[PDB]
Amino acid sequence: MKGILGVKVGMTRIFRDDRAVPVTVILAGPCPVVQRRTPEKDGYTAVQLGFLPQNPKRVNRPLKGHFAKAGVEPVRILREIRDFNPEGDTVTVEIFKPGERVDVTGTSKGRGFAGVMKRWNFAGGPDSHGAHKIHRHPGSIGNRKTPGRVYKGKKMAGHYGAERVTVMNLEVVDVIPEENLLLVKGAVPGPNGGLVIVRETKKA
Amino acid sequence: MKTYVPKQVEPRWVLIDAEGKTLGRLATKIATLLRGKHRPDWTPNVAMGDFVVVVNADKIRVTGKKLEQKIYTRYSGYPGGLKKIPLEKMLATHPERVLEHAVKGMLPKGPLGRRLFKRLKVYAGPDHPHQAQRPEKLEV
Amino acid sequence: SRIGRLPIPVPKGVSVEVAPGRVKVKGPKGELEVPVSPEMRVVVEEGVVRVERPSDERRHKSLHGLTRTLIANAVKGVSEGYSKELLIKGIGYRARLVGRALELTVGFSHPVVVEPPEGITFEVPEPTRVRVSGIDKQKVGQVAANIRAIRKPSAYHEKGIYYAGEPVRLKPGK
Amino acid sequence: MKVRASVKRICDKCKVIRRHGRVYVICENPKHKQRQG
RNA sequence: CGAUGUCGGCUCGUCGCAUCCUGGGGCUGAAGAAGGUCCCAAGGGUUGGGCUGUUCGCCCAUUAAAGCGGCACGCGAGCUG
RNA sequence: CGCUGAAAGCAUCUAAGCGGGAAGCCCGCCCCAAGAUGAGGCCUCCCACGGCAGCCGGUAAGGACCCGGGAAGACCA
Numbered sequence: 001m002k003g004i005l006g007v008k009v010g011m012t013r014i015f016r017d018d019r020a021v022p023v024t025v026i027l028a029g030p031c032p033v034v035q036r037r038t039p040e041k042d043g044y045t046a047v048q049l050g051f052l053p054q055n056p057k058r059v060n061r062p063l064k065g066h067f068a069k070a071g072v073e074p075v076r077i078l079r080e081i082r083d084f085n086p087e088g089d090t091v092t093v094e095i096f097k098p099g100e101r102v103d104v105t106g107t108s109k110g111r112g113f114a115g116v117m118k119r120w121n122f123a124g125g126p127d128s129h130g131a132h133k134i135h136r137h138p139g140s141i142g143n144r145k146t147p148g149r150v151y152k153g154k155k156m157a158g159h160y161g162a163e164r165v166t167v168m169n170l171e172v173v174d175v176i177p178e179e180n181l182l183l184v185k186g187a188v189p190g191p192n193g194g195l196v197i198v199r200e201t202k203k204a
Numbered sequence: 205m206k207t208y209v210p211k212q213v214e215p216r217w218v219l220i221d222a223e224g225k226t227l228g229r230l231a232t233k234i235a236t237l238l239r240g241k242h243r244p245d246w247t248p249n250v251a252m253g254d255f256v257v258v259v260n261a262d263k264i265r266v267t268g269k270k271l272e273q274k275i276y277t278r279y280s281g282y283p284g285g286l287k288k289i290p291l292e293k294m295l296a297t298h299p300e301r302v303l304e305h306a307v308k309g310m311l312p313k314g315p316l317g318r319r320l321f322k323r324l325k326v327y328a329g330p331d332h333p334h335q336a337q338r339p340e341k342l343e344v
Numbered sequence: 345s346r347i348g349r350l351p352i353p354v355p356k357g358v359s360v361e362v363a364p365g366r367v368k369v370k371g372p373k374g375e376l377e378v379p380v381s382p383e384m385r386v387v388v389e390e391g392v393v394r395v396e397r398p399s400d401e402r403r404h405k406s407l408h409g410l411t412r413t414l415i416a417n418a419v420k421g422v423s424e425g426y427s428k429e430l431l432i433k434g435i436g437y438r439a440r441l442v443g444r445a446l447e448l449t450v451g452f453s454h455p456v457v458v459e460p461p462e463g464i465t466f467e468v469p470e471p472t473r474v475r476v477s478g479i480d481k482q483k484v485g486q487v488a489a490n491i492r493a494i495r496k497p498s499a500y501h502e503k504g505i506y507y508a509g510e511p512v513r514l515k516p517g518k
Numbered sequence: 519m520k521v522r523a524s525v526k527r528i529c530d531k532c533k534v535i536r537r538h539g540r541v542y543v544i545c546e547n548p549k550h551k552q553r554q555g
Numbered sequence: 556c557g558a559u560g561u562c563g564g565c566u567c568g569u570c571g572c573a574u575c576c577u578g579g580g581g582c583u584g585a586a587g588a589a590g591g592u593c594c595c596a597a598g599g600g601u602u603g604g605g606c607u608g609u610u611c612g613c614c615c616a617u618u619a620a621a622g623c624g625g626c627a628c629g630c631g632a633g634c635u636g
Numbered sequence: 637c638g639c640u641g642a643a644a645g646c647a648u649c650u651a652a653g654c655g656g657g658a659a660g661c662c663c664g665c666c667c668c669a670a671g672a673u674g675a676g677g678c679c680u681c682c683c684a685c686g687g688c689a690g691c692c693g694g695u696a697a698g699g700a701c702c703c704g705g706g707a708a709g710a711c712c713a
């Protein structure tokens with residue numbers, strides 16, 4: 001179950017067999033493995049990956065001891081890939097070949113406090129015909145004396161986005177190892193500059 | 205003369221093998237031990253029963269067709285959140301919970317009753333990690 | 345009137361060892377273990393196995409017949425063995441042996457490959473006859489059932505997979 | 519399969535069987551097949 | 556009765572199953588294709604429009620289908636009126 | 637819907653046992669999640685500090701405050 005850490009760099013399209021194919025570019029490698037999780041030790045199998053070099057002056061002592069034990073340079077981010085155990089001490093975009101399908105996880109864009117129409121595609125109200133200050137309101141949220149309460153999970157206004165989202169089965173269109181670049185067809189969660197995780201897809 | 209009230213006593217750790225025993229009839233006895241109602245100085249408002257260790261909880265037994273007809277149930281608070289789990293499935297997934305549930309239902313409700321339940325340690329399989337307390341083996 | 349009382353003739357050389365809750369039968373063709381009610385008693389005599397019941401209660405009466413028959417099928421299984429024949433009927437419909445496997449051409453867009461489980465052997469003498477053979481009576485019958493099920497006898501035509509000796513009962517079309 | 523509260527022999531080939539807690543009627547004539555319910 | 560705002564729509568659902576569709580079956584006066592009838596099944600789905608305050612219903616064009624009921628004939632400290 | 641099969645010499649999917657079998661059930665996918673007080677685990681960092689399972693005090697590893705900001709955001713985080 002291979003995976004790698006990355007930054008979302010931006011979108012373009014390329015031309016492939018006289019087709020415009022939309023791509024998201026991802027700067028993925030290179031990731032040093034700074035800890036391995038084993039069944040005997042941790043109860044499961046995974047690899048802790050590091051990513052983006054950090055100014056040592058910004059790294060406190062407990063984190064520093066963690067890196068040093070790995071014989072590893074200080075890094076900005078630590079993230080695990082589940083059920084992955086690379087043979088090397090370093091994971092690069094080379095683990096992916098064009099044509100492979102990948103799942104991409106990122107932090108979606110934050111919309112802050114979102115209304116019922118933006119968050120849940122509610123229909124809101126009429127904009128004329130007498131409608132009174134409810135153009136974007138949810139309408140009814142319940143019944144009457146039975147049950148005399150509101151369901152857990154009721155769709156209502158509130159914060160929306162800046163949350164973990166995984167998009168599945170994205171086609172790897174190209175990989176450019178000398179630049180640690182991954183091209184994935186289509187759309188990936190979050191802003192340019194966002195941290196993402198790229199994994200081999202779980203769909204068959 | 206006032207009725208005797210005990211100063212705190214070193215609780216007694218007890219070990220029980222559940223293998224082949226009837227689920228409910230074993231539970232009633234574990235509850236009694238938990239409450240400490242076997243002790244002549246029993247006092248209802250303090251935790252003074254035994255600590256009960258149970259092993260081979262997975263090998264608990266049950267009569268009739270209960271393996272497939274006894275349903276454990278859980279409500280999540282959400283619409284349609286009623287979960288139905290048959291005995292067979294519970295035994296095949298979290299076996300120790302079968303006895304735990306049986307006993308919990310036989311303890312008083314309330315703060316003391318909840319505290320008593322924590323003094324029950326149920327293990328599937330023949331082993332427990334409590335050698336340190338040197339549990340005294342109990343035939344029941 | 346009583347199957348359970350009927351003595352089981354044991355041909356030499358097949359051996360019947362009784363055990364708690366089970367009896368093991370060995371013969372020239374293989375061995376079989378028969379699961380047997382602890383309430384029943386299984387008795388080994390000279391060239392004969394017998395089964396006795398503890399009482400005339402309805403359950404014991406029921407287990408008795410069952411047990412003698414079960415043991416008897418085991419005895420027959422390791423000596424004679426068991427077979428079931430299938431007749432394929434219909435113009436395009438044929439079978440052939442592919443390694444150990446049975447390959448049915450019975451009018452689907454594809455052929456059907458049936459895999460022998462352990463203790464089961466397929467034979468295809470004619471293209472329209474299949475034989476399933478093995479020491480285990482219920483297994484032989486099960487697999488033969490499976491193969492027939494692939495394409496059951498039509499209600500309107502003499503077409504499909506038949507048990508040998510199965511009557512062709514048809515209904516009028518139009 | 520006929521499903522009804524009164525299941526009965528329809529012809530002299532009909533056999534009333536009890537199977538898994540239910541009364542069935544089985545017969546060589548498929549029409550006569552009954553399950554109580 | 557020192558007040559429990561009553562039709563219909565909109566919004567938002569959620570539940571029942573005596574199931575409209577999709578999935579699985581038996582019987583058929585089941586050749587096939589298409590149906591009929593009963594059984595299992597509530598996971599999801601169940602269109603847009605003309606008329607009329609309408610609910611309902613009729614009609615137009617489609618559809619896999621254009622299900623029926625409960626929730627104070629669900630929902631006016633949510634809107635309409 | 638079957639296999640094997642008595643009671644009930646036949647028969648029976650069943651009484652012992654075994655197959656097959658739904659968009660439905662359990663899992664599998666995605667998201668939250670140890671206040672899971674049953675408060676879990678692993679890696680790393682500090683250290684046995686003064687006076688009087690408690691108190692005062694100065695520290696350590698760390699953290700907060702304050703400031704420049706941010707596709708994070710009502711404030712807060």
Ligand SMILES: [Mg+2]
Pocket residue numbers: 014015016173174
């Ligand atoms: Mg290219």
Ligand SMILES: [Mg+2]
Pocket residue numbers: 105106107195196197
């Ligand atoms: Mg992220």
Ligand SMILES: [Mg+2]
Pocket residue numbers: 109110111112
């Ligand atoms: Mg935002």
Ligand SMILES: [Mg+2]
Pocket residue numbers: 115116117118124136137138
């Ligand atoms: Mg809104």
Ligand SMILES: [Mg+2]
Pocket residue numbers: 117118121122
């Ligand atoms: Mg919108």
Ligand SMILES: [Mg+2]
Pocket residue numbers: 118119120121
């Ligand atoms: Mg939205």
Ligand SMILES: [Mg+2]
Pocket residue numbers: 123124125
């Ligand atoms: Mg609208």
Ligand SMILES: [Mg+2]
Pocket residue numbers: 126127128129
């Ligand atoms: Mg309007």
Ligand SMILES: [Mg+2]
Pocket residue numbers: 123124125126127
């Ligand atoms: Mg609008």
Ligand SMILES: [Mg+2]
Pocket residue numbers: 130132
């Ligand atoms: Mg107005």
Ligand SMILES: [Mg+2]
Pocket residue numbers: 131132133
């Ligand atoms: Mg307005």
Ligand SMILES: [Mg+2]
Pocket residue numbers: 134137138139140633
């Ligand atoms: Mg509203």
Ligand SMILES: [Mg+2]
Pocket residue numbers: 144
């Ligand atoms: Mg009201």
Ligand SMILES: [Mg+2]
Pocket residue numbers: 147148149
């Ligand atoms: Mg209520």
Ligand SMILES: [Mg+2]
Pocket residue numbers: 159161162
């Ligand atoms: Mg947020």
Ligand SMILES: [Mg+2]
Pocket residue numbers: 190191192
């Ligand atoms: Mg962006």
